[PDB]
Structure formats: structure tokens, C-alpha cells
Write a protein that holds these residues in place. Structure first.
Motif, PDB file in Angstrom:
ATOM      1  N   UNK A 200     -62.757  31.455  73.724  1.00  0.00           N
ATOM      2  CA  UNK A 200     -61.355  31.715  73.983  1.00  0.00           C
ATOM      3  C   UNK A 200     -61.066  33.044  74.642  1.00  0.00           C
ATOM      4  N   UNK A 201     -61.999  33.563  75.434  1.00  0.00           N
ATOM      5  CA  UNK A 201     -61.838  34.855  76.106  1.00  0.00           C
ATOM      6  C   UNK A 201     -61.827  34.653  77.615  1.00  0.00           C
ATOM      7  N   UNK A 202     -60.660  34.627  78.254  1.00  0.00           N
ATOM      8  CA  UNK A 202     -60.639  34.356  79.696  1.00  0.00           C
ATOM      9  C   UNK A 202     -61.176  35.526  80.505  1.00  0.00           C
ATOM     10  N   UNK A 203     -61.793  35.185  81.633  1.00  0.00           N
ATOM     11  CA  UNK A 203     -62.265  36.170  82.591  1.00  0.00           C
ATOM     12  C   UNK A 203     -61.138  36.695  83.464  1.00  0.00           C
ATOM     13  N   UNK A 204     -60.036  35.959  83.562  1.00  0.00           N
ATOM     14  CA  UNK A 204     -58.894  36.347  84.375  1.00  0.00           C
ATOM     15  C   UNK A 204     -57.687  35.597  83.841  1.00  0.00           C
ATOM     16  N   UNK A 205     -56.521  36.245  83.876  1.00  0.00           N
ATOM     17  CA  UNK A 205     -55.242  35.644  83.518  1.00  0.00           C
ATOM     18  C   UNK A 205     -54.374  35.638  84.768  1.00  0.00           C
ATOM     19  N   UNK A 206     -54.007  34.450  85.225  1.00  0.00           N
ATOM     20  CA  UNK A 206     -53.166  34.300  86.402  1.00  0.00           C
ATOM     21  C   UNK A 206     -51.720  34.140  85.965  1.00  0.00           C
ATOM     22  N   UNK A 207     -50.834  34.965  86.515  1.00  0.00           N
ATOM     23  CA  UNK A 207     -49.393  34.778  86.362  1.00  0.00           C
ATOM     24  C   UNK A 207     -48.918  33.979  87.573  1.00  0.00           C
ATOM     25  N   UNK A 208     -48.473  32.752  87.345  1.00  0.00           N
ATOM     26  CA  UNK A 208     -48.084  31.913  88.462  1.00  0.00           C
ATOM     27  C   UNK A 208     -46.754  32.378  89.055  1.00  0.00           C
TER      28      UNK A 208
END
Length: 256
Positions: free
Chosen positions: A64-72
Motif C-alpha cells: 500500500x505504498x505508492x511510488x507516485x500520487x497523481x492529482x488529476x
């Protein structure tokens, strides 16, 4: 490629740990594009859905650890979004617009109003919601499933150019979109799921884009928690059915 002739029993996939509080529908790219690989996973943050979590490694995904978080750059209407050839394709909230969001550059590369498509509850499947517009990927590329006033609620499908979202080819079926629980595309044939709430259901319609003919089918389709979305992954050659937390797979075989 070939006609669908067999669907396997649903097989549960191991669910990622929910400790970090990210458990929305996830997806992989059937045409992985550098810098991503076949193992890259994307998860839609399930409100005003605006986040997409990106996980380079399956190890990270399962923790559950993302490499990147995209804000759309705009909110989503549905979970009927797809990742294909390095882009997230989704429907803008409260609109008939499909948006191509290139993931590594975080840039909107194309926008397209699907001409005449109903949205926001006009042409749902058989069980309501905002499922008017349904993006899909198959062996040939990107498709959108929808309906129009002109089609009188019958399923309409268009092949989409993945670069600029032009509607390269369009078909009007004679299958009422409300008469089925969902639809998916395999090898250029549209298939429909009869029901999600009947344990012993079927794939009950097929529309061949090479012939323009729709037919009834009776391929057993077993529902073992209700699925809320189904998606064909042409790289894995399997259906992925989401129940709001767990993913199950259905193996398929074709008349290849």
C-alpha cells in the motif's frame, strides 16, 4: 484471436493490505510503455475522485505504498476508466467528455466529447448508477461503450484513436444497454454479462464488429460479494471483476 467459447470459475486474487487506506479499483496497462512495465499498478482513490495512486513494484502495491500520487486535472465520473499505452483515459465528472491524461508527464493530451452520448444516469446498465460511458481495451486498442438518444438506448461502441481520441469507427448494436449488467470487448466482439446478482448467470449477448451481427449466448458466468465492475485485460487474457475491495479473475478461452 477468436470467439469466446469458455469462461473459467472465478479465482480470488490476494488483496493488498488496507492499512494505508487505499483500496479503490486498481488497473494495469495492457500495452506497458516506458517508464512503466507490465507490473505497474494504478489505483483510483475511492467523493470528488481526484487522486490516482501509482505503484512501480508489486511489492509496493501489496504494502500500500505508492511510488507516485497523481492529482488529476478534473474529477472522474465513474470507475470505468482504463490505463492504456501510458495514459489514463477517464470520463470527466458530469460530462460526456473522455480525457487522455498522460501519466508520466501529468499532462492532458486530448479531450473528446463523445457525440450525443448520454451521461449522468441517462443510459446506465441494468442496475442504475452513472455507468453511461464505459471505456474498454482489447487486442486492437481503446474503445468506448455508450448510448445516444439517436440509438434509443441501444449499445453504441466506437473505436478510439489513443493519441487524440477521434472516433475512428462506430457501431450501433440492437442490444438495449439497460437490459444487461455490463459489457466488455474481446478481439473486437462486444460481450455482455446477464446479471451480477444471480449466482448462475451467463455471458448472454455477443456483437461482432466484423459482421455487425448480434447473437444470444449462454456461456455460464458464475457470480460468487457482488461484482461492481468487470474489465478485460488483453495482455493477461483474463477478465478482472471488482467487488469494491477484492479482485477476482475469470480465465477465458477463444476460438483462436
Amino acid at each position: 484471436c477468436g470467439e469466446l467459447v469458455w469462461v473459467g470459475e472465478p479465482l480470488t486474487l490476494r488483496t493488498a493490505e488496507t492499512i494505508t487506506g487505499k483500496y479503490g479499483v486498481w488497473m494495469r496497462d495492457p500495452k506497458p510503455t516506458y517508464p512503466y512495465t507490465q507490473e505497474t499498478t494504478w489505483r483510483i482513490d475511492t467523493t470528488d475522485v481526484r487522486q490516482v495512486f501509482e505503484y512501480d513494484l508489486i511489492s509496493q502495491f501489496m504494502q500500500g505504498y505508492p511510488s507516485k500520487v497523481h492529482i488529476l486535472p478534473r474529477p472522474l465520473e465513474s470507475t470505468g476508466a482504463v490505463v492504456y499505452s501510458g495514459s489514463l483515459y477517464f470520463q470527466g465528472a458530469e460530462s460526456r467528455t473522455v480525457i487522455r491524461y498522460e501519466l508520466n508527464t501529468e499532462t492532458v493530451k486530448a479531450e473528446k466529447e463523445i457525440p450525443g452520448a448520454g451521461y449522468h444516469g441517462q443510459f446506465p446498465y441494468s442496475w442504475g448508477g452513472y455507468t453511461d460511458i464505459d471505456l474498454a481495451v482489447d487486442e486492437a486498442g481503446l474503445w468506448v461503450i455508450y448510448s445516444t438518444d439517436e440509438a434509443k438506448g441501444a449499445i453504441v461502441l466506437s473505436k478510439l484513436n489513443p493519441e487524440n481520441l477521434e472516433l475512428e469507427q462506430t457501431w450501433e448494436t440492437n442490444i438495449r444497454k439497460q437490459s444487461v449488467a455490463e459489457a466488455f470487448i474481446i478481439c473486437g466482439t462486444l460481450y455482455t454479462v446477464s446479471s451480477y446478482t444471480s449466482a448462475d448467470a451467463t455471458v448472454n449477448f455477443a456483437y461482432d464488429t466484423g459482421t455487425g451481427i448480434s447473437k444470444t449466448l449462454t456461456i455460464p458466468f458464475k457470480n460468487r460479494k457482488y461484482s461492481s465492475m468487470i474489465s478485460y485485460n488483453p495482455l493477461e487474457k483474463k477478465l478482472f471483476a471488482w467487488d469494491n475491495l477484492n479482485m477476482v479473475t475469470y480465465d477465458i478461452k477463444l476460438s483462436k
